[PDB]
A paper describes a structure:
The starting point of the engineering efforts reported here is a Kemp eliminase we previously obtained through minimalist design on a β-lactamase background. Our design took advantage of the conformational flexibility of an ancestral β-lactamase scaffold to produce both a suitable cavity and a catalytic base within it through a single mutation, while a second mutation enhanced relevant interactions at the de novo active site. Kemp elimination is a straightforward proton–abstraction reaction that can be performed by a simple molecular machinery consisting, at the bare minimum, of a catalytic base. FuncLib does not per se predict mutations that enhance catalysis, but rather suggests variants with multiple mutations that generate stabilizing interacting networks at the active site, thus focusing the search to safe regions of the sequence space.
These particular structures were chosen as they are all highly active variants, in terms of the measured rates within the available substrate concentration range, with improved catalytic parameters over GNCA4-WT. The protein backbones of these new structures are essentially superimposable with that of the background GNCA4-WT variant and, therefore, the observed enhancement of catalysis is likely linked to small rearrangements in the de novo active site. For these variants, the calculated values fall to within 1.3 kcal mol–1 of the experimental values, and can deviate by up to 2.2 kcal mol–1 from the values calculated from the FuncLib predicted structures. In the case of GNCA-2, which has the largest deviation between the calculated activation free energies using the crystal and FuncLib structures (ΔΔG‡calc = 2.2 kcal mol–1 with the crystal structure giving better agreement with experiment), we observed subtle structural differences the crystal and FuncLib structures. Specifically, we observe different rotamers of the R256 and L291 side chains, as well as also subtle displacements of both the side chain of the catalytic base D229 (which is further from the substrate in the FuncLib predicted structure). We note that we have attempted to further refine our EVB calculations by exploring other approaches to generate the starting structures, such as predicting mutations using SCWRL63 or inserting point mutations manually using the Dunbrack rotamer library, as implemented in Chimera.
Residue numbers in the entry:
A (entry chain C), C (entry chain A): 27 to 58, 60 to 238, 240 to 252, 254 to 294
B (entry chain B): 27 to 58, 60 to 238, 240 to 252, 254 to 295
Write the structure that this text describes.
């Protein structure tokens, strides 16, 4: 219980509530700190969104090259890619890439539309045995992160196990598994979070999330050199420290976890 | 037509709108009084909620032993089992048992979340050919029972038929069928309603519902001695009599239906 | 295209926004004018609603002869058939017939209940590869047609493609496709729109839509003599002319599309 104690101290310093799940596929060994408590997902849901879209592509019900057009009026805030393509539109794949690697919010709304809504995202998760995660609203309202509101939440343990199933299970075809991995590995938004505490020679894919009420999140798949991948889901909400210090909490969680795994071997 | 006249009179004495459906599987014989009209389900939907969960267990997408945790602030009113387990949580199976046999409302929400919400329960019902019943809202709001509002409603006939399909058709595995039976037979909230009016030697499973606007419901599977099961769905809403008197209306429906089915055979 | 320019002028006279898609199954030829912009469906979605009901009949999950009863409080405006059957109810088939050929609004709400609501119609569309069209609301609210609101919209191109798939593809059984076709051919509400501008010896089925903000729509399947069918989806919204002039805009679209198709040869 040393990791547990250090995480509790860290949580105390943050002023908020911190959830952590680790899933090591070399052994099946897990670790949880509030792993079975609900947390607002904010943009971490977008990893699941892209999986759902890829599943439809595997089914022949969707095409990565299909072009979606939209208006200036459709933009919501934090849309650094989609705001550049009002004139020419974007393909389903480009929206996926933008939603994951730049956390583009309009991209995610267009892609929820492609599924038919947040309820369809939730059905896809239920179809793969994640009985926990739920999406309820669109961008930007799904980031309100109100305490005690179960909408648009997951648990760290549920997210970790679902990310595992998606990337290593047979939910997605091999080509779609690789595509999702490649998008996560190319994430541009996460350099001050889990990536920052991880050893530099770890190969990392991640998706961040950020919201109201001091919410800062990050989920990742990590390949240490010559080892099976490890899944790490970290959620922080109700934090009373500023945005930089919240990023550092997440970076510190990776440091703490890595050091804990080191003392297993 | 004598049973229909009797039920018209009892309806007048309830001061509300009464709905009855009977489905005898010995013969397929049916009877309805307003069997075609919508009524607020209130907790009777939980029988269907448990069925949806079990079907996902059948499918390997859900596990009855899967533990679910929650906090004090997730509790809603009428949660006598879930309020005792804020600390250690409950399994899928324990929640379905609390939802059925104690009508626990928070257990029902947690289970709705396990399906993905009211719309997922509705979709389950559409997937077994129930094109009538609909769940729109969560607990406690789905009990508002406002006249003319179709949300969260069924008809007596559709609920009797869906209950028959669930317990005796091939929607559920045989193990899951028996589990749903066992839960309804184990119900603790229905002693003043249909059970009260049925002959003591009948073996009975039921699920009650109770809501605003004087809404008082009960659905049952009933095995008379050496006889095939009969399904009985009874809905009472907009009633102007007090709660013990509404319960007695339901008990009287069971007495009248039993007496009329006797007159069938003899 | 001269046709694109002719439609631009017609659009400008209308003061609103005009969308046109043509899909010719004899040749594969396609034409679009704003074919990829979203437009409020209003009652044109009822052609999709019926198809989704017929799908379930085909699946053994629904019955055309099933009777639905309802009370007088359940009626919404524009229910010329259902208001005559509060006493005795209507069958599913009757309700589809009323929703398509008289654009009965209560009939559409009862059938939407039969599916389980707007999201279940959206899920039907997604299941056949229409990743665009969406239903969100019930009658009468789905007709508000606010500019910029993507609820209850399609695109002219998506709707022409979906209609083609429903009426000619393998989604519906031979009997259900013929039944949908017969209902469209029996439409009573479209005499001043596309039908009015098509040559009199064309065999036509159609579904109209009308809404707030100057919205007037008509989608149609057309069989010219001795020819495979042509799908024609025409949406007009934000128009600044009165209801009769908007109908005449739709008639003129048909005339212009016919003339353009003649001058291909
Ligand atoms: O992601 N991780 O939970 C994790 C665990 C152990 C490690 N060792 N090196 N990188 C690691 C990452
Ligand atoms: O549940 N029943 O409607 C029902 C009908 C006839 C009966 N006879 N004995 N028990 C009976 C129950
Ligand atoms: O519906 N049409 O787009 C259409 C196009 C060309 C035609 N020529 N004859 N009828 C026609 C209908
Ligand atoms: Na009526």
């Amino acid at each position: 219980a040393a990791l547990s104690e250090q995480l509790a101290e860290l949580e105390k310093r943050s002023g908020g509530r911190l959830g952590v799940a680790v899933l090591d596929t070399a052994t099946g060994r897990r670790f949880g700190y509030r792993g079975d408590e609900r947390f607002p997902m904010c943009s971490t849901f977008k990893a699941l969104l892209a999986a759902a879209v890829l599943a439809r592509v595997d089914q022949g019900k969707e095409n990565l090259d299909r072009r979606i057009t939209y208006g200036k009026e459709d933009l919501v805030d934090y849309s650094p890619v989609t705001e550049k393509h009002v004139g020419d539109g974007m393909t389903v794949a480009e929206l996926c890439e933008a939603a994951i690697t730049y956390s583009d919010n309009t991209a995610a709304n267009l892609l929820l539309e492609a599924l038919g809504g947040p309820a369809a995202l939730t059905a896809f998760l239920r179809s793969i045995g994640d009985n926990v995660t739920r999406l309820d609203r669109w961008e930007p309202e799904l980031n309100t992160a109100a305490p005690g509101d179960p909408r648009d939440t997951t648990t760290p343990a549920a997210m970790a196990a679902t990310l595992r199933t998606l990337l290593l299970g047979d939910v997605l075809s091999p080509a779609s598994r690789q595509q999702l991995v490649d998008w996560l590995i190319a994430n541009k938004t996460g350099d001050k979070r889990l990536r920052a505490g991880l050893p530099a020679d770890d190969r990392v894919g991640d998706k961040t999330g950020t919201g109201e009420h001091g919410t800062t999140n990050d989920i990742a798949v990590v390949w240490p050199p010559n080892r099976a991948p490890i899944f790490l889901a970290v959620y922080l909400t109700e934090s009373q420290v500023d945005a930089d210090a919240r990023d550092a909490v997440i970076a510190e969680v990776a440091r703490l976890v890595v050091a804990a795994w080191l003392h297993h071997h």
